[PDB]
Amino acid sequence: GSMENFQKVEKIGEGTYGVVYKARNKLTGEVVALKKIRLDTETEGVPSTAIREISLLKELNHPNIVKLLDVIHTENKLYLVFEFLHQDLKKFMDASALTGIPLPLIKSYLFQLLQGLAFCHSHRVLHRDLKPQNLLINTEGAIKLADFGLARAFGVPVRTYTHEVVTLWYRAPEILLGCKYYSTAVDIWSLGCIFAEMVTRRALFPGDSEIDQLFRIFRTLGTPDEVVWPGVTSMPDYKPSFPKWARQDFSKVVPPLDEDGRSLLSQMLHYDPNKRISAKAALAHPFFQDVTKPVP
Amino acid sequence: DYHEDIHTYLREMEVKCKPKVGYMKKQPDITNSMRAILVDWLVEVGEEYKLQNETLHLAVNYIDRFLSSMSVLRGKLQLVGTAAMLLASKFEEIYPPEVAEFVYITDDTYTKKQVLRMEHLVLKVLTFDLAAPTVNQFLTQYFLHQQPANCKVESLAMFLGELSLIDADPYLKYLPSVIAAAAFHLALYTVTGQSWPESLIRKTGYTLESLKPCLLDLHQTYLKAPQHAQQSIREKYKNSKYHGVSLLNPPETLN
Numbered sequence: 357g358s359m360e361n362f363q364k365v366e367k368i369g370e371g372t373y374g375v376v377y378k379a380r381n382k383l384t385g386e387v388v389a390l391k392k393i394r395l396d397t398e399t400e401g402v403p404s405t406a407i408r409e410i411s412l413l414k415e416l417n418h419p420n421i422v423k424l425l426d427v428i429h430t431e432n433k434l435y436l437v438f439e440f441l442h443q444d445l446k447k448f449m450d451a452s453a454l455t456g457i458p459l460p461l462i463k464s465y466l467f468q469l470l471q472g473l474a475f476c477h478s479h480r481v482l483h484r485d486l487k488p489q490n491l492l493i494n495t496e497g498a499i500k501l502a503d504f505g506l507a508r509a510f511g512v513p514v515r516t517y518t519h520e521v522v523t524l525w526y527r528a529p530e531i532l533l534g535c536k537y538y539s540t541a542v543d544i545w546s547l548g549c550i551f552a553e554m555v556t557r558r559a560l561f562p563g564d565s566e567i568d569q570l571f572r573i574f575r576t577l578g579t580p581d582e583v584v585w586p587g588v589t590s591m592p593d594y595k596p597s598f599p600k601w602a603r604q605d606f607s608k609v610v611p612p613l614d615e616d617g618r619s620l621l622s623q624m625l626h627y628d629p630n631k632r633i634s635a636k637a638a639l640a641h642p643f644f645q646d647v648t649k650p651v652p
Numbered sequence: 653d654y655h656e657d658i659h660t661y662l663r664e665m666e667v668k669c670k671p672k673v674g675y676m677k678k679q680p681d682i683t684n685s686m687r688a689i690l691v692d693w694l695v696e697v698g699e700e701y702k703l704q705n706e707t708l709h710l711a712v713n714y715i716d717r718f719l720s721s722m723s724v725l726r727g728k729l730q731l732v733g734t735a736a737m738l739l740a741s742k743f744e745e746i747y748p749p750e751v752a753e754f755v756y757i758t759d760d761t762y763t764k765k766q767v768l769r770m771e772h773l774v775l776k777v778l779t780f781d782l783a784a785p786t787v788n789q790f791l792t793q794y795f796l797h798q799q800p801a802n803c804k805v806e807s808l809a810m811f812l813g814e815l816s817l818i819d820a821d822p823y824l825k826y827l828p829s830v831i832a833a834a835a836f837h838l839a840l841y842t843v844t845g846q847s848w849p850e851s852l853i854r855k856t857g858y859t860l861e862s863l864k865p866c867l868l869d870l871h872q873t874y875l876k877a878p879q880h881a882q883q884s885i886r887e888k889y890k891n892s893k894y895h896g897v898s899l900l901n902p903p904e905t906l907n
């Protein structure tokens with residue numbers, strides 16, 4: 357393996373298992389993102405995250421999923437070559453703090469994100485780390501799912517999977533309650549939080565801990581009962597001592613949102629994972645009837 | 653809920669991840685018998701480390717695909733298998749055993765360096781295509797077609813399907829979805845006298861007619877199981893964990 361054809365331009369960031377650079381193919385002129393993965397050649401070998409990220413990403417070709425272009429093998433290093441995108445959604449949100457993201461673009465971005473996610477779920481893949489940092493946009497008005505290092509192929513029906521999943525703020529209630537089983541619904545929850553965040557200009561549930569996180573959700577959507585969430589009381593980390601907060605008027609939760617927007621959001625943030633709306637089903641929601649593709 | 657899209661996709665992928673049916677004849681130094689020994693051992697390893705059955709199924713698939721394109725000497729067969737089990741664990745397990753544990757299980761036959769290097773070679777050979785559909789994956793879907801779920805049926809189906817892993821001849825010529833089909837019906841018929849249900853006929857497009865060849869092979873494997881050289885699977889399914897389904901008697905006929 358050889359990277360002689362790639363010229364490094366500047367660094368994009370790190371992740372723990374992989375360092376990321378913006379690079380240029382010297383022969384074709386193509387700009388790419390290079391993810392460098394150190395192999396633990398004297399101890400643990402190839403990291404399980406890399407194994408999953410690569411095997412799964414190879415199956416997923418879709419307009420709204422970042423493209424893995426090549427994998428370059430070295431005895432000691434793995435280089436993932438991704439198509440390059442100009443910016444992530446988190447940084448775009450910071451740049452849009454003063455003016456906010458136009459609703460037509462928010463709608464477009466959410467629509468595209470659901471298309472990407474639906475493809476994932478259609479192909480038995482859970483992302484499990486959906487957050488603005490992992491969503492990439494270009495100059496054309498496209499947005500794509502990225503960073504599949506926490507993803508995994510699920511089964512029908514699911515088994516118990518890794519409990520330590522999803523960045524805290526975007527983590528579904530069932531996970532916080534220590535559910536024996538979780539599935540596609542956890543990804544939808546994350547997009548829900550992200551939808552709300554694009555609108556309000558701040559995280560919906562910025563928890564400082566697992567219990568804070570869970571309580572922030574309770575104080576907004578109301579504390580779930582066996583009526584609203586069949587089985588909640590029987591969840592491993594559920595406790596009867598949980599304070600019982602009343603549900604807030606969605607009108608307040610996310611003011612700028614219309615009737616359909618609030619409708620969609622409420623279904624994406626439904627407590628019962630069984631009732632929580634799917635990516636596929638979400639795409640057919642009235643809110644997208646007039647969707648367009650603006651440029652940032 | 654994607655249950656249909658997923659099934660359709662898996663049906664597509666099981667063809668692409670399919671091992672070369674007659675590869676063993678092109679392996680100068682290894683045979684079906686050695687493979688059977690290797691797989692039987694991986695069953696034990698799975699038991700020893702409480703790995704998922706799916707991990708076992710994945711490892712076998714990696715092995716058959718590796719041996720489809722790579723000639724291997726008998727002395728290195730276990731190394732391939734150990735690395736395949738390592739990769740399957742990493743892909744599928746929440747808590748994979750560490751490499752040292754995989755070295756230890758080979759009773760000092762190979763070094764850690766060898767295991768690690770074989771891991772990378774296996775990955776290169778499979779071009780990182782590790783998300784293979786397994787007999788186990790189809791079975792679990794098929795199970796959702798019960799009313800209610802019968803614990804013995806499921807366990808006995810998992811048992812039969814697992815037995816198929818041991819014997820390249822004749823099971824390499826059957827797709828996982830088909831093997832799962834025969835296993836589910838055979839288990840069901842043994843436990844409740846019931847047959848391949850209509851809802852599954854509609855889902856899979858498979859009928860008892862189409863499943864016949866595999867089913868006749870599977871029935872014979874079931875009947876002759878107690879005399880098979882490899883016995884790890886039967887011993888494993890004696891446990892209450894699987895409701896001792898391996899102690900049940902195979903039907904004499906299927907009709």
Ligand SMILES: CNc1nc(C)c(-c2nc(Nc3cccc(O)c3)ncc2C#N)s1
Pocket residue numbers: 368369371376389390391422438439440441442443444447489490492502503
């Ligand atoms: C987890 N986030 C990242 N992983 C990869 C490999 C990255 C990536 N980056 C860009 N461009 C870019 C530019 C500015 C900020 C930023 O976060 C990204 N394009 C594609 C990928 C991929 N895959 S960063």
